[PDB]
Amino acid sequence: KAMADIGSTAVPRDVNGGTPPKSCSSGPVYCCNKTEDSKHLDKGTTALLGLLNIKIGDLKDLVGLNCSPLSVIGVGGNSCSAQTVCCTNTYQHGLVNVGCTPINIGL
8 A cells, every 4th residue: 555566556646745735746837828729829929930940730639829937936926927738848938838737727
C-alpha cells in the first residue's frame, strides 16, 4: 500500500505537498484575455500564427492572445484577473499562445 509497492494504490492526482492553487507540471499556467479556438482562429489571429510559422491544423485546444505567463505562483502568477488556462507553449510574450486548456486553479 504505497510503501513497498505502487500497484495497490492508484492516486495520480494526489500529490505530496498539494499547494492550494492548482497548476500544470508541464509548465507555467497562462492568464489570457481570451482563449481562441485553435480549430478556427480569426484571420487576424491566423495571421500572427502564420507570421510565427505556426501550424493551425496542428493546433489542439485553444490559443491565447495577449496572454500573461503565470510561472511564479503568488504575486504575479496568482494575480491573474483575466482568464486562466494551461497552455503547452507560448509565443510573442503572450500575443499568441498554444495548447491552452481551461484550468481550475481551485481558489
